[PDB]
UniProtKB/Swiss-Prot annotation, chain A:
Subcellular localization: Mitochondrion; Mitochondrion inner membrane
Parent-protein residues present: 7 to 91 of 101
N-terminal signal peptide: none
Any single biological process term in GO: proton motive force-driven ATP synthesis
UniProt miscellaneous comment: Present with 14600 molecules/cell in log phase SD medium.
Key words of the record: ATP synthesis, CF(0), Hydrogen ion transport, Ion transport, Membrane, Mitochondrion, Mitochondrion inner membrane, Transit peptide, Transport
Subunit architecture: F-type ATPases have 2 components, CF(1) - the catalytic core - and CF(0) - the membrane proton channel. In yeast, the dimeric form of ATP synthase consists of 17 polypeptides: alpha, beta, gamma, delta, epsilon, 4 (B), 5 (OSCP), 6 (A), 8, 9 (C), d, E (Tim11), f, g, h, i/j and k.
Gene designation: ATP17
Record flagged with keyword RNA-binding: no
Role noted for this protein: Mitochondrial membrane ATP synthase (F(1)F(0) ATP synthase or Complex V) produces ATP from ADP in the presence of a proton gradient across the membrane which is generated by electron transport complexes of the respiratory chain. F-type ATPases consist of two structural domains, F(1) - containing the extramembraneous catalytic core and F(0) - containing the membrane proton channel, linked together by a central stalk and a peripheral stalk. During catalysis, ATP synthesis in the catalytic domain of F(1) is coupled via a rotary mechanism of the central stalk subunits to proton translocation.
Family that this chain belongs to: Belongs to the ATPase F chain family.
UniProt name for this protein: ATP synthase subunit f, mitochondrial
GO CC terms, sorted: mitochondrial inner membrane; mitochondrion; proton-transporting ATP synthase complex
Swiss-Prot record, chain B:
Membrane topology: Single-pass membrane protein
Native source organism of the sequence: Saccharomyces cerevisiae (strain ATCC 204508 / S288c)
Protein name: ATP synthase protein 8
Pfam families per the UniProt record, alphabetical: Fun_ATP-synt_8 (PF05933)
Subunit (UniProt): F-type ATPases have 2 components, CF(1) - the catalytic core - and CF(0) - the membrane proton channel. In yeast, the dimeric form of ATP synthase consists of 17 polypeptides: alpha, beta, gamma, delta, epsilon, 4 (B), 5 (OSCP), 6 (A), 8, 9 (C), d, E (Tim11), f, g, h, i/j and k.
Signal peptide location: none
Family of the protein in this entry: Belongs to the ATPase protein 8 family.
Subcellular location: Mitochondrion membrane
GO biological process per UniProt: proton motive force-driven ATP synthesis
Keyword Transmembrane attributed: yes
Organism superkingdom: Eukaryota
Statement: the UniProt record of this protein carries the keyword Transmembrane helix: yes
Amino acid sequence: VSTLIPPKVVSSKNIGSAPNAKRIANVVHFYKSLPQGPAPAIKANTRLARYKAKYFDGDNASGKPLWHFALGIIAFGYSMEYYFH
Amino acid sequence: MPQLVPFYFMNQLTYGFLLMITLLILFSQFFLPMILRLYVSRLFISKL
């Protein structure tokens, strides 16, 4: 018949196709785009990372920290009047 | 009491202009470019 056939030698579609550009981009750019980052500051013993943990975290958005922050100034100016009195 | 009545305007204004200069530099060099850092990073992630 003919055993001469096209698919037995290929050497340009075996490496050929466009998504290679996207590939070489995302192996180099993305491997240090860590899922949770490198564990950021959110709670630690400094006594203000604790403050961040309780009040000013991403989790927080409820009015409880707002209230907590608010109450201080009321006591502050009233006392400071009497510290200046 | 004296502390409770402003007459101390020249002293006061010293403390006033100090706060402004501090914030102006602080925003300009630190916090505004740091917000722009978030924006640029988000956009490059958007790009790839």
